[PDB]
Scaffold this active site. Structure first.
Site, short mmCIF file in Angstrom:
data_model
loop_
_atom_site.label_atom_id
_atom_site.label_comp_id
_atom_site.label_asym_id
_atom_site.label_seq_id
_atom_site.Cartn_x
_atom_site.Cartn_y
_atom_site.Cartn_z
N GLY A 1 7.29 5.86 7.14
CA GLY A 1 6.39 7.00 7.22
C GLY A 1 6.70 7.84 8.45
N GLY B 1 -4.30 1.07 5.27
CA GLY B 1 -3.14 0.90 6.13
C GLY B 1 -3.51 0.46 7.53
N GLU C 1 10.70 17.53 13.46
CA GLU C 1 10.97 17.22 12.06
C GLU C 1 9.95 17.96 11.20
OE1 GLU C 1 9.78 13.39 10.51
OE2 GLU C 1 11.63 13.18 9.34
N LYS D 1 0.87 -1.18 0.00
CA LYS D 1 0.00 0.00 0.00
C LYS D 1 0.91 1.22 0.00
CE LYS D 1 -1.33 2.83 2.80
NZ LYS D 1 -1.27 4.00 1.89
N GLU E 1 10.21 2.25 10.08
CA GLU E 1 11.19 3.19 9.53
C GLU E 1 10.56 4.58 9.56
OE1 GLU E 1 14.23 2.65 8.01
OE2 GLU E 1 14.38 0.44 8.12
N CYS F 1 13.92 11.18 4.70
CA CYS F 1 14.07 10.83 6.11
C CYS F 1 15.48 11.13 6.60
CB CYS F 1 13.76 9.36 6.32
SG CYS F 1 14.67 8.27 5.22
#
Ligand SMILES: [Mg+2]
Ligand SMILES: [Mg+2]
Ligand SMILES: [Mg+2]
EC number: 1.2.1.31
Lengths: 509, 508, 508, 508
Positions: free
Chosen positions: B244, B228, B397, B188, B266, B300
């Site tokens: 994500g 998801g 972030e 997905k 991750e 990332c």
């Protein structure tokens, strides 16, 4: 009226135990929490008392351990291994008395209590060698003038929560490995095995102190669910190794995941033995007996489901019944006793409830089923036939000596029945068929973490990794590369060349 | 008005894309869910549409993948490797057009889009060799007449949820490894990179079909949070690999833990570069630029914190300013462009919100800070000085090209400042000091999954395991023994004798 | 008159062969030595000619290879892997015609010639993954502030001497592994397969030259014992990989040991199949036939001794005789042929002598034993019963299809009889008994490098290391950590501190 | 007159030594060969006598060892590890007195004699863990229904021949590893360290006998070149580990290769330290002192060549001279003595001869060069400047404390000078330059088996593999996967399927 005050149990003082013992160690001994008395399950008499950890005890201990880590992590891994070697030797010196304490407070027979200490001794020897070996590969970078290395470093503080059934060895597995990997440890054992926890901590503390190391490297905060939940919620606990029930361990895993910690979960089993038509029945019957009734059925790896091919089912069940009836019952420390009491009075209650739920669900008790009329928590080891493989009571882990026996005919169906439960710890088949053995070991075979052939579900050795899948929690302990769970991997690229990056049209100075 | 209906974009049809595409693949193509239109972030024009998965589509596809697994897990690993090799070749054949689609739909420049497909090609070639190597040791039992072996077997169905920033290669890392390990996959992707997901799946589907294998081995169910979340709660998804945000990853990790599934997470990064007084500045300045502004700061591994020793802080900032001025901005396909648009207009609002916080928290915008006056989602790459290392906005972030610069004096403190954030993905020091380098790599050094020296925070090749610590989530992809996350270990003892010796010499 | 100058064989030109071919490649093609004609063993007709290496050709080639090493060793291993990947593809492009050349010049059947080329392709794909993996562990020093690393580095020039029986794959195993390990190679194949060596070298030369790499990285010096001996004595040949007879291999191993070089020796076999009373006879008989007569009995791994339990000896012999009678004999490129010629006329003479000797030592020829009256080097595949297990001719390796059959009774003696010969390559038992299988694999079982259960002595796969013990020479090729033989290990301690603690706490 | 009969040296009896000792052990103690008396090099007095092995002793010992192997190989590796653990504890309980004997009979100082015994204790601890780990991978076969396993099994009898310079640890490294790998051992130490060999064997023999095991598992046959040559020629010695001079080792390697045995050769060194202009001289000078004068310059790993950048050459030599003059000379078993005698009177003469040869070839003795005016075999540790790096005497290994000092300017030339000698054991650079360090560790760097940075050439830890390249002979001992040299690899394929082979047209 405490056992430790009677002359018969004077050997308890060889472990440094007294009437009331400090249950917190962080370089100093203490305990300002609730005082717990533990009882001998063979006679329900009080042994001694342990002062458990208050919240302030816990706070000061976690701080002291992390402070000690600053020193411990700077000690080269092989010299950390030397400490673990000395712990191994210190356990060798006390193996008989410590094994006796295991029998007295937990209730397993003496050879299993001694054998449990041996497991800790064993993993110490293993970890000493491992302390010269832990690390990662240096890999070939695709970049000229660059190195690529995989480094491994301690996570910091490893919290270790353990169960009553293996009150020495599970801690020892985590301790020896976490130690050589550069971590400090904080132990909260099962409250009903508090004296064992204190006795093991006294042995380790002397080795640490004798080596002029801060004792908080191997800290102890005795307590119950309060201290355990605090460890599960504590961002300062970098790794939480939990051994216990699936029900508690599921909440511990969630709490650790919520804070992005690391957890190592060693949870319940519902382990099946499968006897095919070509099985050596002289192996099957004693193997099934030990796996089912060893430790009075209170191992995570205890055989609780026995699948027998329909051709040999009746013969095996009749031989197993005759086998059960020859088991010698008595005080677990007494010579030649093979079967002692359940760990708690509550366990006797659970035992009776499961037996009743089995008869309700259509099972037939063909051996045992009742409490024994004697002091202690003694129940009869029990064999139940006639249930369907998918009966509810058969799919739940009942931490008691109740063995559910099923018929089968087809290899594919019985492999599926092995795998259909939520637990995934241990599994065994008994067969001579070469291809069936390799199918059992392959992708359409057992789904468990321990997949055995012609031996029972219990009694692993330390060379391999120990743990299970699915609701058993996924963690591994002891051998192979289980050590990596106690460390953090980094992937490290070192540019040692004077080469400049491609300017890509930009005029740099 | 769809770009795919304009002759200028006819190359899209080389990937099998049409005006309306099916977003479900399980051997057959379909999609009964909502139709999503994806847009080119360089001009905000619609590209094409994708019919996403309904719940029924997802149910159907999970069941077909799990049936397909029974065939696939029976194929010897080297032969699964041969399939993955052919996938590698099929990507090679379409690397230019697939890279172009990545630039079109996601927005990174063409060399990064092409280089992203090359990452998938490279992991295929790595996995082919791995397919002949995966397994465990045979160990010496302490008992006579017993064998002790460590076996590795597939977990079953690997669900793979991916983000917009690497819409090809993260899936590729998971797919190549999971396939040779004998698992089936269910992908997905990010909704805003649905065409990329369809195009990659078209490429893999042809290979599977050509080898007479069930296509559900590499299933696709395009969708958003609804699909998801289903995967995260689905006991039939044995391993859920999620790439994500930390915010979403945390919930996924919880949902998987609740069902005693496996997850590989991750998540976010807040990656720092540290330049010590002895650093080669001719290395620092370009390294920082391409780590901060590559992918318009949407990796990332993007460098978001730059710590510069006091003695060289002003010179490095002045040189970085002069270099940012020469960043060539344009459409992500425009030849020799270095810098394209942000992925969404929401990303622009987040960029402006962060620039505003930094100015009000006491920072100085020494370069950039403004929206570019042109079509699409373009912002100026931005450098902020004057903030304290612990300023709130710096610990967040913000997925945009904002580089926060800090001074420092001592090694101990700046190492602490590297580690003080919640994320733990990538990290870099620039120095020549031998001792400092090995201290950085050691137990009192960086706490990150990626720990680099004289290369920026995006230094990562496939030979090593890729992933981070702390709130980055702990998972690893690609190299080293990352493959073990896609398999279940068993410890197997075989008694081939007629005796029953118990471990630890226990006499029953 | 030359086959290459005939139309039925014009496909030979697809490999770039012509009437007279250069047999030296070092980036340039040449050859000032003697011109050899190679012959088709199925009909004794000349195929084409090869100009072999003079001593001066050899000298120049070694020098150029070592010069190319300076460039090649500086190429990162993953990029060397990419070169090997391209070799794999180039082999794939020519697999059918190169296989056809193998059947024509060497004489094995077409499926085996193609199969041999496939093995080279396979090790290329394996090596590409390995090129991101080779290296050693970083270990924990007992000393504070020290790092301890195991490095691996190329040895330099790997000389590779190969035999006629596998004229492509043995070189390919050595080439692919040596290349990713950063070595240059120098190949001297068997003189009677010179066209094969030239055709392979043409394929690799093109890949190197297309990549602008020095061709001497994969150098060729066709020649006989004179060139082979020069390699064995040459200090500049850092590793000599030798595949061939034990008699020649012993001298090569001594010459290399004399100069403190490295050798990798892959020598003769005398491989036994053992069939126990419980064996699946429908499995034993075809396995024995394939292993005995495959490649006309001209594999190092060919089954040459068959031990059958006395209860089933007659049944297996009778069944094997019935199956031998159905072996289809003819031209090895004819697609319906299972059994072609021996490689040389001297091979036929040696076959006849061994049959003669077997009769004189009391053996009975129960099938075959005669040279065939037809063009080419054809002999009947042969079964001999009645010899004692220690008959001298049974302990000799005769490189021909003669299978010696023995009765046995108990497991202990037949394991000893497997082990009693000087060779130590391959071995097989057929049984269903679990304990017997694990005893076979243990310290009192087979002493061979390949130890098989319910499959014949031949046909290994590339994932494992390939080679034997005892007079087979000890070397390994292909899989597992065989790559370490092509590299030099260093144990490296780096003090990055300001102190000097000594190992073992020595206070100096 | 014998030291062992003077009360001063009564502590020798704590090791079980007497005036005359049996030098053969195979379960029983004997020795019908020549009686040798060993002397204390510090005072040239006789210590005690050892009855060495006759040919009949050697024959009987090999037989009993190989008989004992039948038992020992059946003991699971972890239980073999438990025996090695007890040997470690036995050595622990005797470390001070055993090290004192090493100092008395061999002549190295007490901290080194103890540290040598510590090395043996270290490898015992290591081997115990290794006994749970030795083995190979289970690998994924390309064939359905087949397993592929790499097994490791003992080679059988491991002969171990050792040198005088490490009379304990070299044997210990080989013994502990060979033991856990399931081999029996036969030891022939240096004749001039026979008392040490006997003392070590008494410690081990007690452990074996206490564990009801046959003592021939660790056999001992004291003797000279005649016993050593017999081991080299003996087909029953499956692996011969030889530590000693290149001259003798070359002949041992050729003898073992003649019979297709296995050898592990640990021969001479000519080890260089290189100090670049940026080196920390506070590390250079003490490191060079220990590396060159430790063990009175009688280690295989002793530094014999010191290359110093032109800019710092004079200062380092000046500082070295001052360091040399400060070392305390005395009897080596006395605490705090730093410098003892050479091992023999012949060594003193060869020292004087080399100093003479160095003067002939143009060198200047800047320190030392003469015998010391005291009883025993004492010579001044010696520093020679002004020779060319290619001076003949500098390329000879002279086993005495003579350090040859050279100037250099450029990195590439001095790496080449490190590599130009025939030996390839140890090497060290002193520098702070990150790139130079990784080039030293790389393919164009040191060619030695031990490649160090900012530490001397000598004093390895056990965790890595120990040995060298080129004329050092290629063997490895101790750590990493050195254990594989003590075992034979088998590649094992197990068909567990009911699949019958393809009939290929034949009616089976
Ligand atoms: Mg409970
Ligand atoms: Mg988002
Ligand atoms: Mg000598």
């Amino acid at each position: 009226t405490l056992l430790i005050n009677q002359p018969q149990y004077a050997w308890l003082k060889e472990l440094g135990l007294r009437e009331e013992n400090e249950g917190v160690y962080n370089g100093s001994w203490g305990g300002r929490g609730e005082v717990i008395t533990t009882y001998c399950p063979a006679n329900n008499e009080p042994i001694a008392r342990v002062r458990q950890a208050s919240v302030a005890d816990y706070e000061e201990t976690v701080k002291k351990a992390r402070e000690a880590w600053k020193i411990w992590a700077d000690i080269p891994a092989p010299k950390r291994g030397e400490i673990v070697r000395q712990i191994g030797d210190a356990l060798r010196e006390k193996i008989q008395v410590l094994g006796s304490l295991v029998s007295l407070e937990m209730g397993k027979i003496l050879v299993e209590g001694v054998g449990e200490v041996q497991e800790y001794v064993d993993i110490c020897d293993y970890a000493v060698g491992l302390s010269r070996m832990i690390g990662g590969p240096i890999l070939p970078s695709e970049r000229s003038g660059h190195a690529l290395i995989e480094q491994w470093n301690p996570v910091g503080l490893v919290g270790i929560i353990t169960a009553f059934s293996f009150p020495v060895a599970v801690y020892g597995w985590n301790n020896a490995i976490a130690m050589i990997c550069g971590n400090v440890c904080l132990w909260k054992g099962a409250p009903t095995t508090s004296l064992i926890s204190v006795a093991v901590t006294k042995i380790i503390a002397k080795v640490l102190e004798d080596n002029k190391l801060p004792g908080a490297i191997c800290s102890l905060t005795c307590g119950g669910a309060d201290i355990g939940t605090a460890m599960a919620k504590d961002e300062r606990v970098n790794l939480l190794s939990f051994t216990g029930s699936t029900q508690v361990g599921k909440q511990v895993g969630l709490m650790v995941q919520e804070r992005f910690g690391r957890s190592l979960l060693e949870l319940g089993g519902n382990n099946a033995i499968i006897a095919f038509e070509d099985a050596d029945l002289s192996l099957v019957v004693p193997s099934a007996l030990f796996a089912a009734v060893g430790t009075a059925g209170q191992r995570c790896t205890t055989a609780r489901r026995l699948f027998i091919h329909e051709s040999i089912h009746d013969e095996v069940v009749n031989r197993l019944k005759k086998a059960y009836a020859q088991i010698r019952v008595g005080n677990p420390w007494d010579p030649n006793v093979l079967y002692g009491p359940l760990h708690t009075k509550q366990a006797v209650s659970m035992f009776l409830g499961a037996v009743e739920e089995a008869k309700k669900e259509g099972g037939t008790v063909v051996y045992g089923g009742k409490v024994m009329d004697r002091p202690g928590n003694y129940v009869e080891p029990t064999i139940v036939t006639g249930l369907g493989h998918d009966a509810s009571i058969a799919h739940t882990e009942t931490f008691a000596p109740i063995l559910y026996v099923f018929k089968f005919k087809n290899e594919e169906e019985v492999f599926a029945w092995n795998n259909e439960v939520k637990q995934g710890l241990s599994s065994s088949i008994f067969t001579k068929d070469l291809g069936r053995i390799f199918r059992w070991l392959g992708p359409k075979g057992s789904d468990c973490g321990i997949v055995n052939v012609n031996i029972p579900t219990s009694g692993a050795e330390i060379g391999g990794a120990f743990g299970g899948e699915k609701h058993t929690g996924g963690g591994r302990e002891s051998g192979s590369d289980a050590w990596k769970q106690y460390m953090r991997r980094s992937t490290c690229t070192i540019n040692y060349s004077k080469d400049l990056p491609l300017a890509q049209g930009i005029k740099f100075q």
